[PDB]
Amino acid sequence: ARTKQTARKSTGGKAPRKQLATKAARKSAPATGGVKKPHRYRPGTVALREIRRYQKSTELLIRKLPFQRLVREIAQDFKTDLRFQSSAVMALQEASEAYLVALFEDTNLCAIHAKRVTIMPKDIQLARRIRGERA
Amino acid sequence: KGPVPFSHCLPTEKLQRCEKIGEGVFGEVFQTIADHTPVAIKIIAIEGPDLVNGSHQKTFEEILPEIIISKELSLLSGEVCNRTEGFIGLNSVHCVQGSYPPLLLKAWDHYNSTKGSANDRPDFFKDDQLFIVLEFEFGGIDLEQMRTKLSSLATAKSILHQLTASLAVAEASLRFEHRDLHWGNVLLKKTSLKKLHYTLNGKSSTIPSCGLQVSIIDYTLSRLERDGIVVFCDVSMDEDLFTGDGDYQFDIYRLMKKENNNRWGEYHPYSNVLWLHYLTDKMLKQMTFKTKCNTPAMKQIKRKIQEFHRTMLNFSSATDLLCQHSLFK
Amino acid sequence: KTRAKAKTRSSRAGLQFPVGRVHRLLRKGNYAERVGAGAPVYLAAVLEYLTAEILELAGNAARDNKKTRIIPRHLQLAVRNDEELNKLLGRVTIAQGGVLPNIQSVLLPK
Amino acid sequence: TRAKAKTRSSRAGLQFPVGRVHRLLRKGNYAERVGAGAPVYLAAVLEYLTAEILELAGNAARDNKKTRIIPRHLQLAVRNDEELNKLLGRVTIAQGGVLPNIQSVLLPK
Amino acid sequence: KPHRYRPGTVALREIRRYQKSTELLIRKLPFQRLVREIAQDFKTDLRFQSSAVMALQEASEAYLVALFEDTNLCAIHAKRVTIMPKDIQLARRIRGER
Amino acid sequence: RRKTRKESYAIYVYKVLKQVHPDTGISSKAMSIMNSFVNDVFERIAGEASRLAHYNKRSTITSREIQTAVRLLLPGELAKHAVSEGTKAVTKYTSA
Amino acid sequence: RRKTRKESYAIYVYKVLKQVHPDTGISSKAMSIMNSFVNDVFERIAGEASRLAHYNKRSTITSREIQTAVRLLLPGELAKHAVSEGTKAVTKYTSAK
Amino acid sequence: KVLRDNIQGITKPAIRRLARRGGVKRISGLIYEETRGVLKVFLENVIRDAVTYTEHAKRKTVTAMDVVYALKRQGRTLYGFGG
Amino acid sequence: KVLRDNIQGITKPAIRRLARRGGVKRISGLIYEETRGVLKVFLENVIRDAVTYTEHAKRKTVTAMDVVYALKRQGRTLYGFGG
DNA sequence: CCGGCAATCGATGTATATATCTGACACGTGCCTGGAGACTAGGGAGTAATCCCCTTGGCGGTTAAAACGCGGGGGACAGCGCGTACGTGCGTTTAAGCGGTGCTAGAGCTGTCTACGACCAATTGAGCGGCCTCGGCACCGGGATTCTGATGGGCGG
DNA sequence: CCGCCCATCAGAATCCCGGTGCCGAGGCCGCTCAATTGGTCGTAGACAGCTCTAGCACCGCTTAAACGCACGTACGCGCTGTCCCCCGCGTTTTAACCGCCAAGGGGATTACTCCCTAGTCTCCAGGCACGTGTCAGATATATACATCGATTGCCGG
């Protein structure tokens, strides 16, 4: 703001000399693909990577708008022309997520007990029956 | 007297304590401590045959109006009909003969090393070169460097109110047009006073301070009138000023020229109004604030500033805007 | 005359939690017709002890992660890794807590 | 000349005591005050539930060629009805037994 | 040739027989001795009423019968007809109790 | 020296039983069971009503609290019939 | 000051935290969680004590009821420390009254 | 304005993510419908209790406090939402 | 009069009878030790709570009301023995 | 000319019919304590008016996630064979159960009387609600480093 | 002649810095009202004494259940083969998310009645403890009757 605009003589590339003078190039592996072989991880590896990834974070795993629409649709059965605060829907979502995660843990234990690796509906049924939720 | 040596005006104690603060077409700006007070020194090379920094040297009979308006705006802080401390006071202005001492040369070298400069090295001047030195109070840091340092919108409102009050007082008292309020030209200083007092035509009022005090500088292209005589510089022949682009500030000169039909000698206070516009534009676009706008009261005042920005173009002068617009009521 | 200044009951008991407020809450909660003069002190001491225990464990967990503020993840980690506190809050859900990293041995690659 | 007293159960047309329930509500540390219509409601609800259970148990007892109800019949009545079984889901009845039930795979071929 | 039943007949007869009566299946004196020995650790020189021991026995037997039903369900889930300790452990783990 | 009297619900349970099945008796253990049942249900409903009253910053227990607690505690059916019985009893009482 | 005032346990929790870990902070969500925890435990202990007093045909709540409720509610190795702390506090209060 | 068929908005990848957080490696092809059904049952119970609480207070808006009270009544306490 | 080695009084036929009422057809040989352990743990918990109630009441005899209160506290309400 | 399917034939355990004998259940009586009638004082709850915050609904841009198709590797599931652990039954040993006899520790009740908790009036300082600043924490981007999985090339009894 | 090991290669995962954007501590005022201080006063419970119920200990005799051993077969477990069906990866299509903006519905606060509940005194009827018979259920004996396991007896490829 000297009353006129010029080029960039005011600053002698201060930001570059302070940082990224020439370091702004390439990083990590530079060569990728370029092979006839179709690079592929064997089945079961990315599954374990996802297991390790999602057991470390804390954020919600369901899109908010579909859940809110479902909640309103369910609630309209008991009374018409209802209203909600935001924190009410947030609390409902948190409780639902926690319940489902615990149920899946129990289901996995039941599946392993039968000498398998895949979970089937019968495992969910047995878990809910023993838990006392279903008679 | 006259072109006294630099040593008389700059003792070795002040010479060693000079810190480079700025550069420009006019010259150089340093900071030192004198009389147990931080003071700024502006140094300009005058009455020379050489060309420096892309322009020829400036004479004395055109720099006289600059010092005249500077002393007028400094002394208006003592008048009883209209009082305001929005300007900088005059300490001393004097003439020097000699060359540039190496201390300020190495200070300039350090300034280039840290920040960089847009001019040349001032080491070509001999003994016979003539210089002018102006002494001013310390004002603080420019708004440009304080962009990520403002607190919230309340500080913004206080700054705008102070600027408007100062400009209104100037117009009402001395019919002033300064016409170069770019955001690198206002200064912010920390203060402890809770309120600021201003007098216009005998009526006094107070403004919240919010922990800051604003000031204006660099009156090199200003216009004023006194007792039927006008002081200004005619700049109607250099169009490079109006060739700018890349910012609406570059367009404000063209818009003002359109408003006044390329006649600089006329008094049109409305020009200053659009200058506020540009600052307000900056205050809404190029600032980062520490505090979010979660408070409803701050939402209300933000809406107030938005409406002020979108509707203040319809007012006549600074006084009308101050005494009519709902923002300050 | 002079009533000899004042002194909160927390100061005489050496606690940090309020004693008067606990008394007022016990009186207005419909627990019994009359309330003794020593019950609020006991209750305040117990609550302060439990708070200090949980906070210390959470702070250790937060420091381990190289952060200087406690967030709900650290509270969940502190609670679930201590047997006694885990048994105390056995039917409680903490928002934004997550789970404990744990994978069965059968599912691991050979 | 006080009029001859008329108990509150008679006015409500019930079989359960209303004054006793009022006293129990008052001297129980539930609230500061107790309204005049609460005991009637509570007594009616309790009588209804008792009548339901008793009728089912008496049917079960008659099915066994008896004329007196014992805990076995109460268990048979409670465990064979969905709503009562849901209500008393965490309750043990002494000397009740269990319901006859064998998994189908265990049966001989 | 002496008469002999095939393995499984008498088991089904006993299943039908014990699901129709409503008695206690544990002898009383050993249970009383066990209760006193267990309580010996918390306080010395205690006395019990008769109804206290009776209530304890009733609750214990109800608990054991329910646990055995859950164990049978778990064992059948894995294509077996014999119950093994792993079934008890899985049932207790899922039910919530340690 | 006197033996303190103890109160129970046997009289009313016997009255209701003679009302429903007019030719059926009962034993002592069954009477104890029904006594415990009535006590348990009373405690559940009263506690829920008290909590409901405290939630809204009110100082009295009315029939609205009892009705809401009944609707909250009882399963799907057994909740309409109980509500109808209570409303009928209250209206009959207040009419007389 | 227009809104009616609301009370919480934030100040005392912050004092305890700054006493245990002198150079650590806390966020608002953690503050809410701590507040809920304190209220829940208070409610549990008070309800147990009231039931104990009612069982014994008393009409007053004393420190014996609180002590027995603490023994009944908390698991082992947590009951003992809480009992010790409460006894110390009561003795100090009584002596200096 | 009547909503219809919104349970289909609980996608398949979302169920997969929940299972992954649970620690599951292989998922069959008939699990998604079961998950949708059990979620519907859970939500029905909780929302019915919350709406009862809201109605009693002669109010027309469901707040977080009703949800917290209903969850506590079912036996699943929740910390952190105005508890 | 110290008592020792009484868990062996829960004989094998008694466990067989309980299993038969449970609906079990075939049994292993290692089940009895597990059953004895779980029974011991259950009894320990209940008796500890009952004795705490008795000690608060300032008595030396354990009554049926203490057992009933302990069972109700643990969430296993029992009907029939008073209360 | 057998491997089968049905039809007997014997033996064992459970359900059913009739006669005697008891103790637990169904009433009758007397008494006293807890509920009903009658009346007053005051404060909690209902109703109207008003303010303003938060919930619903709309529009446009972008882009991250959901939907779809296909090849193929690894797991679910059936069939088979073998060995031993568990069920059924008999002869012998042990301790539970029942019926009395005797002792006293401790639960349960009553009467006296003091000390601790409720209630009130005057005084005052803790704690919460508005407005405001600001130092550093968390976050992102890039670049480098590491670590791990999937591969071919080999010596050998 | 079946291999079972090692050295390379590429792709995620994790570290190091530099710049940005906001949050969580605090500072002030201003009240509001709830906690502290100093009294009086009525009753809950601590304490001491007494009565008598029921819990504990021991002994003798019967009979049913627990225990040990022999024998055989059906169930559990390991191994092989086959085929379907989920996983990993690239391409195309849908709608969630972000930012901003009006409109007004319903929750929250203030003031004013006024009817409903607690509290007190008097009186008598409902409900509890105690004592007697008689009859529903328990016990004993005999008698079918349904079902399990082995043997006979022909029978079509």
TrEMBL record, chain C:
GO terms for biological process: heterochromatin formation. Keywords: Acetylation, Chromosome, DNA-binding, Isopeptide bond, Nucleosome core, Nucleus, Phosphoprotein, Ubl conjugation. Residues 1-10 have a biased composition (Basic residues). Its main location: nucleus. Residues 83-110 form the Histone H2A C-terminal domain. Residues 1-80 form the Core Histone H2A/H2B/H3 domain. It is found in: Chromosome; Nucleus. GO terms for molecular function: DNA binding; protein heterodimerization activity; structural constituent of chromatin. One of its GO terms (cellular component) is nucleus. The nucleosome is a histone octamer containing two molecules each of H2A, H2B, H3 and H4 assembled in one H3-H4 heterotetramer and two H2A-H2B heterodimers. The octamer wraps approximately 147 bp of DNA. Core component of nucleosome. Nucleosomes wrap and compact DNA into chromatin, limiting DNA accessibility to the cellular machineries which require DNA as a template. Histones thereby play a central role in transcription regulation, DNA repair, DNA replication and chromosomal stability. DNA accessibility is regulated via a complex set of post-translational modifications of histones, also called histone code, and nucleosome remodeling. Belongs to the histone H2A family. This is Histone H2A. It comes from Xenopus laevis. The lineage of its organism: Eukaryota, Metazoa, Chordata, Craniata, Vertebrata. The gene is LOC494591.
